[PDB]
DNA sequence: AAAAAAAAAAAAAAAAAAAAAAAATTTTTTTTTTTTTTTTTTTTTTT
DNA sequence: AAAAAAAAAAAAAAAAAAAAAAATTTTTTTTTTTTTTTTTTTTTTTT
């Protein structure tokens, strides 16, 4: 055999401390519950909060952070022992239970640039964007061979010597028996582990301006291989180590470094929100007690900082809630995504509304008229340059799939790009193809666009068709088109100015002392935890300088986010009464005689107008948590479309 | 562990004593008859159905699904052992490899010395003398997996996936057993190839040369060797099964033997096979370990869900005179109205008869261009036709442009050569190419489409490519607006240019709104007198029509000429018509006759063709 | 597919002044088989 | 191999493998420096280090 | 970890047969009684009659007498399993149990003059007169080491490769820790087994008068070391094997043959 | 070790140890033949072989 | 709105910096064993 | 019974064969990375 340790004092102490920490039963069983949850979910990787670990035993936390491999092995042994104690069969099912880390890393939290050799063999939490990924390959961790000549069955094991001294003996795949009998490998019986290599680059918006970006190579293994794709703003918690070179004889002293990832995370904004019992109870209470005016309350509480534009705010809320897709048995599809175009006079806060949607709605992609040009906007087809094979790169729409694309300077956008996105706006999919590849990417995103009317400022004395240079083909697929006019009414100016000045004079309680400048400079960002991958919530915003007073509260941002997320899943069904009402209203709307004279249509009326009527009714039902599209929902939809589709020509 | 001799006996027992009533209710030895056939060398591929196996031995099915390669070899060896006792006569030596096998067996018998024990390596390899191949058919209880989810945890298992075929190499000979002949003794040497590469042998290990201690340099040659039809394809996930924001994932499928030439790029396929690795030596492995590629070895390829490769009920349905209208109304039942448009689309899906009179082809394809205002369901119609037709390519404005429509050149991997890969038109070579936003399509793309319409080919004379492609597809363009935009370029080419103007109207708009709202209520069109045909039935009927070439009797010659002359006079008097319009008449009438499933076109078909043509023409006004 | 390695199989030497060592071994074998001692009488 | 052999067969010819875990590594950067444009003679390509 | 054996048909059959032979309750009970006797006497070697083994199982007898090493390994595994079944607490005391043979050996009963190459790896019974009897030296089979710097304790295991190919890594005695800390060997915790080498000579009366004597070298491991002294007449039963030479790029065909005694009994 | 193709990392120089138990051994003996005393010429020594 | 010019990109070809792979018996030493010689010790023969 | 001569025993020194031990970096390849270039294609400007 060989050397076998008997009394490793450090290993015994580490195992004891980690098992004590994982007991947690007296410590409100946080990690007991986590272990039980992973057992039920059939997972074999425990994510541990380093902050809790440090609180329990700062010594163990420091030892783990500064000595990665040894302490991680001890932690995994303790986790396997705990899993066996809770349930032995599962522990025997899974050979090794891995431990990934999470929380606030004081100094270990770095970027690919600040990640220097001082962090070798330490636990580092590096932020960045995945520049490239590799195919998921299986590495044999235990091979099984059968010898026909002797009917024997052997099993060879290969250890994970990724960042350890490896010799030819350990990495030789048997191909003969001791008597030179050919073997045959039993692939089914053999054990493989999935392995992938990615590249994390410093975020361009974080990198020093004008310099080339700093990268790092990351190794992912079983249960972490496909946690990211190129262009993902990922946080990788791992162990930084030097990769061994090939058996040489002369060494230059240069060692490639790599990050053995122990955990991968995406932007927490798109993550599944945590709904506690009290939170769901509050949502139930809100929906039940207030249903008649809940949609109006949410619409008015949507963007507190932007005054007026009540109809536009309601339309934006409908866009956020979305409709419901129709998946017909014969494959025909109907989008449930509302498209909104805000056009009007300069300085009407349309860009502010788009920015608010970007900040709030999950999977919201900003874009500018000329910022994205075709292949950048939709998907693109390139070549690997190393394999000679075609490859697909997701554009803004694809990345915004099941989300929102907030486009600004839509008018400035070239006609080619608008023609290209025509398909996305209605079918919600991108159809690209080159000679060696063809795909139909899913882009189920709602387009919220902003534009400036021709002549810079809206012309009250010209038809909306002439004011808007967008042709009918592109106008139709916009479900709602709102003309936001900078009317010069003295009273509206009074209200707007009062709101703006109040918002400017507001200061955040506690953090601001009356003279602080909150800007930081490229260091505090890494010093403190990133508020982009981080881990009690009220319902109505407490009175503050934002508003003076009234008998109508304003919904909290977090509560509104949770409520919208819950309500978006609802798929209210269209009732016969609402269906008949919508059909008759669509007939009347299409019949031009209904609308008065001196009134010009913003956009043409079409079957798509009917479809957006249905979608708006569905969105109102979702807001109400109704589960059925009712007469009030149909009324609100018809009201909104009637307001949006007609504008009075002044003279 | 398991005793593979016992497993071989189990598979022998199953293969011998499994019976089914498939043959017209009569009990039959499903696999016994196949064994007889391939012992006579009348069949090559033996597809063992794991549902059949599980009918009496579920544990064997589980073991196969866990170690499919091992049991694949067990089944192949059992078949080979059983063949001699099922042979009932002498084969006719249909193949040179059969000649080689006959000679090898005869000479082994001649130098048998039955009692003597020959060394384990002094024997013909199993693969060298098979002339057959055993594949599986995955058990129906195994839910198909997603290419993304097929990972290292299921290597060596038997799994079935479904997806779109993107890239498919050609069929080329892959060495399976390299045969060498010595220059001193006169024996043969056999190297069974398993790795992607092999190092040819130099010295002959035959007994005679070993005794002589002579040179014994042996010569690799293809005559006595054992090749197998080989292909390598890329299979792509389906759009509906891809995650929210990701792109579809690809898998490599290695097809061998009789599974070749089944799938072609653009096909929707389901492939069942074993998830196996390829050793990845040769590179400067950055990370230590035995890393390997991944691939699916094709055991069962089945085109499905768009291009799947009769009954008294369907015969009666065809015999019904309103079968034409039934199919038309079944085309996109959700879309309200557009009855004549849907009838034209059905005529497109059917197509006319191809003509080859004295060295020039008058193609029978039907070209239709849907001009219309926004929101008249042109895109929906084109998408539905794409889903319905067997070989359908739906190309939007510019995402698939240039080489997205025409072929390009890409480096290969099996040969490292420059292979010509087809574009959308070639992928729809003999089907339907639904072009959307044809007006906004690029100029080069529009010229390519014009050329394919006029010739069914695509000539290219660029730098890296110089070829004359073949794309015998029918163009279904959907442009938007001489009204306001009615190019003579489109008029002169499209056999049916339809204008779809939606003037507001209380009654029609209300009916359409009720249709739409019921559709959104029940995920289906409102119930009608006639239930629309399922896509499978529509495809079956259309395919049966396609092979029903009706001819034009000389009696209708004067009738057609009179109609054409009358249309010419009307067009001349009014404020476009030509031989292209006459050929449109001819092929539309032929397609209507084909739909009726007769051999001779009739005045009713001619009248319907003229009626559709006049509806299209006066849609302009 | 690049994991296993079967041996190299071979067949018998069908077909085909110094005499090859295999020929001489065959002659030794025939000498052992067909050396006759005695007489028809005995 | 330095090990004081105990009469066994001696270790192989080239027995030593780097232990990347047991190494002390430091940052190291390579820069390119160019002759200042003024310092360059009139007709002369800049020097590099 | 390395190439372990998952299942082995021949080893499983051999161990099952030997355990069946050792388990005697439906039979007379001779060997169950013998195992109980050795348990009571605190020994770790059982003397099994080759005649009884041949009577109950001819195939096992032939296998044991023609390929002794692995067959004796299987027999000793079965013996340890049986002793554990009778009483596990005693079976835990001794790492391994040994199987000596006795009875009648048909053609395997030879003199040192008749012990030729044909009996290599077989079990043989040789009766002769002891000439040389070396000292009983301890041979370390498991060495315990302590690192004063890191307070760690280590165990190094050395396989009994007397007749198997041995590589230096197996026999490397550790002296320094991973980071070159000094290691002190703990003699009180290490494990050593008595080892001795003797020579058995053809009995003077039975040897041919004219010619010189013929002798054979015999290795006695623990429990068989001080059983014989020079001049004694003894019967040694054991495996006749070949001793590996030392590492070298050149070799003559010559091999040094010995007899690993499995039992020694007085004349 | 000619079988280095099973893995890129290479085996040492002079790596082979003879396995004793896998040796087909035979009996061999050495004898000292001396010329016949009646063959040795009168004044001479007995030759050996 | 169409044609021409500009550039922008994609892909393919080419040339170094670093790392990785390939190739490799002969001379001398020592240990054991065996034999020869010297002296001491023991044995045997003669008085 | 003792002394003298013979022979044996014990012990030490020397020689021959055979198994063991010691010594033993340079040169070439080649892969990856970077840059260069030719053509196709796309965008912008002008009439
Ligand atoms: N109704 C309003 N209430 C509050 N602020 C407004 C309003 N309209 C315009 N603004 C202010 O105008 C500024 C810029 O408007 P912007 O979002 O750029 O609109 P546009 O995109 O039309 O230029 C914002 O800081 C915003 O506070
Ligand atoms: N005649 C119709 N019947 C049913 N639905 C229609 C009809 N016309 C338009 N629609 C609906 O209006 C939407 C827009 O149709 P689309 O296919 O984009 O028209 P276009 O081809 O003119 O762009 C689709 O969701 C479609 O379901
Ligand atoms: Mg703006
Ligand atoms: Mg369209
Ligand atoms: Zn030969």
mmCIF file of N, CA and C in Angstrom, chain E residues 146-229:
data_model
loop_
_atom_site.group_PDB
_atom_site.id
_atom_site.type_symbol
_atom_site.label_atom_id
_atom_site.label_comp_id
_atom_site.label_asym_id
_atom_site.label_seq_id
_atom_site.Cartn_x
_atom_site.Cartn_y
_atom_site.Cartn_z
ATOM 1 N N UNK E 146 6.556 9.503 13.278
ATOM 2 C CA UNK E 146 6.049 10.680 13.966
ATOM 3 C C UNK E 146 6.856 11.889 13.527
ATOM 4 N N UNK E 147 6.167 12.986 13.215
ATOM 5 C CA UNK E 147 6.837 14.214 12.815
ATOM 6 C C UNK E 147 6.778 15.200 13.969
ATOM 7 N N UNK E 148 7.880 15.451 14.680
ATOM 8 C CA UNK E 148 7.808 16.386 15.814
ATOM 9 C C UNK E 148 7.371 17.781 15.414
ATOM 10 N N UNK E 149 7.701 18.216 14.198
ATOM 11 C CA UNK E 149 7.344 19.564 13.771
ATOM 12 C C UNK E 149 5.835 19.721 13.638
ATOM 13 N N UNK E 150 5.185 18.804 12.922
ATOM 14 C CA UNK E 150 3.763 18.907 12.629
ATOM 15 C C UNK E 150 2.898 18.027 13.520
ATOM 16 N N UNK E 151 3.490 17.291 14.455
ATOM 17 C CA UNK E 151 2.776 16.400 15.364
ATOM 18 C C UNK E 151 2.010 15.300 14.637
ATOM 19 N N UNK E 152 2.226 15.134 13.337
ATOM 20 C CA UNK E 152 1.520 14.114 12.584
ATOM 21 C C UNK E 152 2.117 12.735 12.843
ATOM 22 N N UNK E 153 1.291 11.715 12.640
ATOM 23 C CA UNK E 153 1.715 10.325 12.687
ATOM 24 C C UNK E 153 1.326 9.649 11.382
ATOM 25 N N UNK E 154 2.217 8.808 10.875
ATOM 26 C CA UNK E 154 2.059 8.183 9.571
ATOM 27 C C UNK E 154 2.290 6.689 9.715
ATOM 28 N N UNK E 155 1.695 5.921 8.806
ATOM 29 C CA UNK E 155 1.907 4.483 8.731
ATOM 30 C C UNK E 155 2.282 4.116 7.306
ATOM 31 N N UNK E 156 3.387 3.399 7.158
ATOM 32 C CA UNK E 156 3.858 2.921 5.869
ATOM 33 C C UNK E 156 3.720 1.407 5.842
ATOM 34 N N UNK E 157 3.134 0.891 4.766
ATOM 35 C CA UNK E 157 2.835 -0.525 4.621
ATOM 36 C C UNK E 157 3.746 -1.123 3.561
ATOM 37 N N UNK E 158 4.423 -2.211 3.910
ATOM 38 C CA UNK E 158 5.319 -2.909 3.000
ATOM 39 C C UNK E 158 4.750 -4.294 2.735
ATOM 40 N N UNK E 159 4.520 -4.604 1.465
ATOM 41 C CA UNK E 159 3.969 -5.896 1.096
ATOM 42 C C UNK E 159 5.061 -6.958 1.086
ATOM 43 N N UNK E 160 4.676 -8.180 1.449
ATOM 44 C CA UNK E 160 5.597 -9.314 1.464
ATOM 45 C C UNK E 160 5.831 -9.758 0.023
ATOM 46 N N UNK E 161 6.808 -9.118 -0.616
ATOM 47 C CA UNK E 161 7.148 -9.369 -2.016
ATOM 48 C C UNK E 161 8.349 -10.296 -2.144
ATOM 49 N N UNK E 162 8.470 -11.262 -1.231
ATOM 50 C CA UNK E 162 9.617 -12.165 -1.242
ATOM 51 C C UNK E 162 9.821 -12.796 -2.612
ATOM 52 N N UNK E 163 8.731 -13.168 -3.280
ATOM 53 C CA UNK E 163 8.803 -13.837 -4.570
ATOM 54 C C UNK E 163 8.094 -13.079 -5.683
ATOM 55 N N UNK E 164 7.513 -11.922 -5.393
ATOM 56 C CA UNK E 164 6.854 -11.097 -6.393
ATOM 57 C C UNK E 164 7.773 -9.956 -6.812
ATOM 58 N N UNK E 165 7.497 -9.402 -7.993
ATOM 59 C CA UNK E 165 8.262 -8.254 -8.460
ATOM 60 C C UNK E 165 8.072 -7.108 -7.480
ATOM 61 N N UNK E 166 9.181 -6.511 -7.055
ATOM 62 C CA UNK E 166 9.168 -5.421 -6.093
ATOM 63 C C UNK E 166 9.821 -4.199 -6.717
ATOM 64 N N UNK E 167 9.186 -3.045 -6.546
ATOM 65 C CA UNK E 167 9.716 -1.787 -7.034
ATOM 66 C C UNK E 167 10.181 -0.924 -5.864
ATOM 67 N N UNK E 168 11.171 -0.053 -6.075
ATOM 68 C CA UNK E 168 11.742 0.680 -4.932
ATOM 69 C C UNK E 168 10.713 1.458 -4.132
ATOM 70 N N UNK E 169 9.710 2.041 -4.794
ATOM 71 C CA UNK E 169 8.694 2.801 -4.076
ATOM 72 C C UNK E 169 8.066 1.978 -2.961
ATOM 73 N N UNK E 170 7.913 0.671 -3.174
ATOM 74 C CA UNK E 170 7.350 -0.184 -2.137
ATOM 75 C C UNK E 170 8.237 -0.207 -0.900
ATOM 76 N N UNK E 171 9.552 -0.282 -1.093
ATOM 77 C CA UNK E 171 10.494 -0.484 -0.001
ATOM 78 C C UNK E 171 11.110 0.806 0.523
ATOM 79 N N UNK E 172 10.729 1.963 -0.013
ATOM 80 C CA UNK E 172 11.269 3.226 0.480
ATOM 81 C C UNK E 172 10.844 3.427 1.927
ATOM 82 N N UNK E 173 11.805 3.397 2.842
ATOM 83 C CA UNK E 173 11.523 3.694 4.241
ATOM 84 C C UNK E 173 11.492 5.205 4.433
ATOM 85 N N UNK E 174 10.401 5.780 4.936
ATOM 86 C CA UNK E 174 10.321 7.241 5.020
ATOM 87 C C UNK E 174 11.142 7.794 6.175
ATOM 88 N N UNK E 175 11.815 8.911 5.908
ATOM 89 C CA UNK E 175 12.598 9.613 6.916
ATOM 90 C C UNK E 175 12.257 11.088 7.043
ATOM 91 N N UNK E 176 11.707 11.719 6.008
ATOM 92 C CA UNK E 176 11.377 13.134 6.035
ATOM 93 C C UNK E 176 9.908 13.324 5.691
ATOM 94 N N UNK E 177 9.307 14.352 6.282
ATOM 95 C CA UNK E 177 7.925 14.690 5.991
ATOM 96 C C UNK E 177 7.820 15.238 4.567
ATOM 97 N N UNK E 178 6.621 15.695 4.207
ATOM 98 C CA UNK E 178 6.423 16.281 2.887
ATOM 99 C C UNK E 178 7.275 17.531 2.706
ATOM 100 N N UNK E 179 7.403 18.342 3.757
ATOM 101 C CA UNK E 179 8.241 19.534 3.735
ATOM 102 C C UNK E 179 9.589 19.302 4.413
ATOM 103 N N UNK E 180 10.125 18.087 4.305
ATOM 104 C CA UNK E 180 11.472 17.762 4.771
ATOM 105 C C UNK E 180 11.625 17.924 6.280
ATOM 106 N N UNK E 181 10.543 17.760 7.031
ATOM 107 C CA UNK E 181 10.698 17.677 8.473
ATOM 108 C C UNK E 181 11.218 16.294 8.859
ATOM 109 N N UNK E 182 12.001 16.189 9.932
ATOM 110 C CA UNK E 182 12.513 14.871 10.326
ATOM 111 C C UNK E 182 11.409 13.993 10.891
ATOM 112 N N UNK E 183 11.441 12.718 10.515
ATOM 113 C CA UNK E 183 10.497 11.722 11.000
ATOM 114 C C UNK E 183 11.219 10.756 11.927
ATOM 115 N N UNK E 184 10.622 10.495 13.085
ATOM 116 C CA UNK E 184 11.135 9.533 14.047
ATOM 117 C C UNK E 184 10.277 8.280 13.992
ATOM 118 N N UNK E 185 10.907 7.132 13.778
ATOM 119 C CA UNK E 185 10.172 5.876 13.729
ATOM 120 C C UNK E 185 9.829 5.424 15.142
ATOM 121 N N UNK E 186 8.564 5.072 15.357
ATOM 122 C CA UNK E 186 8.086 4.599 16.654
ATOM 123 C C UNK E 186 8.129 3.078 16.632
ATOM 124 N N UNK E 187 9.126 2.504 17.304
ATOM 125 C CA UNK E 187 9.288 1.056 17.279
ATOM 126 C C UNK E 187 8.167 0.362 18.039
ATOM 127 N N UNK E 188 7.685 0.975 19.119
ATOM 128 C CA UNK E 188 6.630 0.364 19.904
ATOM 129 C C UNK E 188 5.322 0.217 19.160
ATOM 130 N N UNK E 189 5.121 0.992 18.095
ATOM 131 C CA UNK E 189 3.890 0.944 17.318
ATOM 132 C C UNK E 189 4.048 0.256 15.974
ATOM 133 N N UNK E 190 5.244 0.261 15.396
ATOM 134 C CA UNK E 190 5.461 -0.454 14.151
ATOM 135 C C UNK E 190 5.192 -1.942 14.354
ATOM 136 N N UNK E 191 5.105 -2.668 13.244
ATOM 137 C CA UNK E 191 4.817 -4.097 13.257
ATOM 138 C C UNK E 191 5.945 -4.826 12.544
ATOM 139 N N UNK E 192 6.520 -5.817 13.220
ATOM 140 C CA UNK E 192 7.583 -6.641 12.672
ATOM 141 C C UNK E 192 7.198 -8.104 12.812
ATOM 142 N N UNK E 193 7.681 -8.920 11.883
ATOM 143 C CA UNK E 193 7.466 -10.358 11.915
ATOM 144 C C UNK E 193 8.810 -11.070 11.909
ATOM 145 N N UNK E 194 8.925 -12.123 12.710
ATOM 146 C CA UNK E 194 10.156 -12.896 12.728
ATOM 147 C C UNK E 194 10.368 -13.579 11.384
ATOM 148 N N UNK E 195 11.606 -13.543 10.901
ATOM 149 C CA UNK E 195 11.980 -14.150 9.636
ATOM 150 C C UNK E 195 13.272 -14.926 9.829
ATOM 151 N N UNK E 196 13.353 -16.094 9.195
ATOM 152 C CA UNK E 196 14.539 -16.926 9.294
ATOM 153 C C UNK E 196 14.725 -17.674 7.986
ATOM 154 N N UNK E 197 15.972 -18.027 7.699
ATOM 155 C CA UNK E 197 16.307 -18.844 6.545
ATOM 156 C C UNK E 197 17.109 -20.039 7.026
ATOM 157 N N UNK E 198 16.713 -21.233 6.593
ATOM 158 C CA UNK E 198 17.427 -22.455 6.920
ATOM 159 C C UNK E 198 17.738 -23.186 5.623
ATOM 160 N N UNK E 199 18.522 -24.250 5.744
ATOM 161 C CA UNK E 199 18.866 -25.094 4.611
ATOM 162 C C UNK E 199 18.549 -26.535 4.971
ATOM 163 N N UNK E 200 17.871 -27.230 4.064
ATOM 164 C CA UNK E 200 17.481 -28.621 4.252
ATOM 165 C C UNK E 200 18.301 -29.455 3.283
ATOM 166 N N UNK E 201 19.011 -30.446 3.810
ATOM 167 C CA UNK E 201 19.897 -31.283 3.021
ATOM 168 C C UNK E 201 19.312 -32.679 2.872
ATOM 169 N N UNK E 202 19.594 -33.301 1.730
ATOM 170 C CA UNK E 202 19.189 -34.680 1.507
ATOM 171 C C UNK E 202 19.731 -35.561 2.623
ATOM 172 N N UNK E 203 18.865 -36.385 3.199
ATOM 173 C CA UNK E 203 19.264 -37.180 4.351
ATOM 174 C C UNK E 203 20.462 -38.050 3.985
ATOM 175 N N UNK E 204 21.509 -38.097 4.816
ATOM 176 C CA UNK E 204 22.710 -38.849 4.415
ATOM 177 C C UNK E 204 22.434 -40.311 4.114
ATOM 178 N N UNK E 205 21.535 -40.943 4.870
ATOM 179 C CA UNK E 205 21.248 -42.354 4.639
ATOM 180 C C UNK E 205 20.448 -42.556 3.359
ATOM 181 N N UNK E 206 19.525 -41.641 3.058
ATOM 182 C CA UNK E 206 18.685 -41.782 1.876
ATOM 183 C C UNK E 206 19.360 -41.276 0.611
ATOM 184 N N UNK E 207 20.351 -40.400 0.734
ATOM 185 C CA UNK E 207 21.024 -39.880 -0.441
ATOM 186 C C UNK E 207 21.876 -40.969 -1.088
ATOM 187 N N UNK E 208 22.113 -40.883 -2.396
ATOM 188 C CA UNK E 208 23.037 -41.828 -3.028
ATOM 189 C C UNK E 208 24.407 -41.752 -2.376
ATOM 190 N N UNK E 209 25.032 -42.917 -2.206
ATOM 191 C CA UNK E 209 26.311 -42.968 -1.505
ATOM 192 C C UNK E 209 27.399 -42.224 -2.270
ATOM 193 N N UNK E 210 27.442 -42.391 -3.592
ATOM 194 C CA UNK E 210 28.576 -41.894 -4.353
ATOM 195 C C UNK E 210 28.685 -40.381 -4.376
ATOM 196 N N UNK E 211 27.570 -39.689 -4.587
ATOM 197 C CA UNK E 211 27.603 -38.286 -4.974
ATOM 198 C C UNK E 211 27.458 -37.357 -3.773
ATOM 199 N N UNK E 212 27.738 -36.079 -4.026
ATOM 200 C CA UNK E 212 27.701 -35.060 -2.997
ATOM 201 C C UNK E 212 26.259 -34.725 -2.624
ATOM 202 N N UNK E 213 26.052 -34.080 -1.481
ATOM 203 C CA UNK E 213 24.687 -33.779 -1.041
ATOM 204 C C UNK E 213 24.022 -32.749 -1.940
ATOM 205 N N UNK E 214 22.701 -32.659 -1.792
ATOM 206 C CA UNK E 214 21.895 -31.625 -2.423
ATOM 207 C C UNK E 214 21.024 -30.976 -1.362
ATOM 208 N N UNK E 215 20.928 -29.651 -1.407
ATOM 209 C CA UNK E 215 20.230 -28.895 -0.381
ATOM 210 C C UNK E 215 19.282 -27.888 -1.016
ATOM 211 N N UNK E 216 18.347 -27.410 -0.200
ATOM 212 C CA UNK E 216 17.352 -26.429 -0.617
ATOM 213 C C UNK E 216 17.221 -25.379 0.475
ATOM 214 N N UNK E 217 17.044 -24.126 0.065
ATOM 215 C CA UNK E 217 16.882 -23.020 0.996
ATOM 216 C C UNK E 217 15.412 -22.855 1.350
ATOM 217 N N UNK E 218 15.142 -22.634 2.632
ATOM 218 C CA UNK E 218 13.785 -22.565 3.153
ATOM 219 C C UNK E 218 13.626 -21.257 3.913
ATOM 220 N N UNK E 219 12.592 -20.498 3.569
ATOM 221 C CA UNK E 219 12.243 -19.272 4.274
ATOM 222 C C UNK E 219 11.115 -19.595 5.241
ATOM 223 N N UNK E 220 11.329 -19.283 6.516
ATOM 224 C CA UNK E 220 10.330 -19.446 7.560
ATOM 225 C C UNK E 220 9.921 -18.067 8.050
ATOM 226 N N UNK E 221 8.636 -17.757 7.937
ATOM 227 C CA UNK E 221 8.104 -16.504 8.440
ATOM 228 C C UNK E 221 7.602 -16.721 9.865
ATOM 229 N N UNK E 222 6.909 -15.727 10.412
ATOM 230 C CA UNK E 222 6.451 -15.796 11.791
ATOM 231 C C UNK E 222 5.775 -17.131 12.070
ATOM 232 N N UNK E 223 5.929 -17.607 13.301
ATOM 233 C CA UNK E 223 5.324 -18.824 13.828
ATOM 234 C C UNK E 223 6.056 -20.077 13.358
ATOM 235 N N UNK E 224 7.030 -19.966 12.454
ATOM 236 C CA UNK E 224 7.774 -21.121 11.966
ATOM 237 C C UNK E 224 9.279 -20.897 12.042
ATOM 238 N N UNK E 225 9.736 -19.987 12.895
ATOM 239 C CA UNK E 225 11.126 -19.543 12.846
ATOM 240 C C UNK E 225 12.038 -20.451 13.660
ATOM 241 N N UNK E 226 11.702 -20.711 14.924
ATOM 242 C CA UNK E 226 12.545 -21.514 15.801
ATOM 243 C C UNK E 226 12.032 -22.942 15.941
ATOM 244 N N UNK E 227 11.406 -23.476 14.893
ATOM 245 C CA UNK E 227 10.902 -24.842 14.929
ATOM 246 C C UNK E 227 11.978 -25.876 14.644
ATOM 247 N N UNK E 228 13.080 -25.483 14.011
ATOM 248 C CA UNK E 228 14.128 -26.419 13.639
ATOM 249 C C UNK E 228 15.487 -25.817 13.953
ATOM 250 N N UNK E 229 16.455 -26.689 14.192
ATOM 251 C CA UNK E 229 17.833 -26.323 14.471
ATOM 252 C C UNK E 229 18.744 -27.214 13.646
#
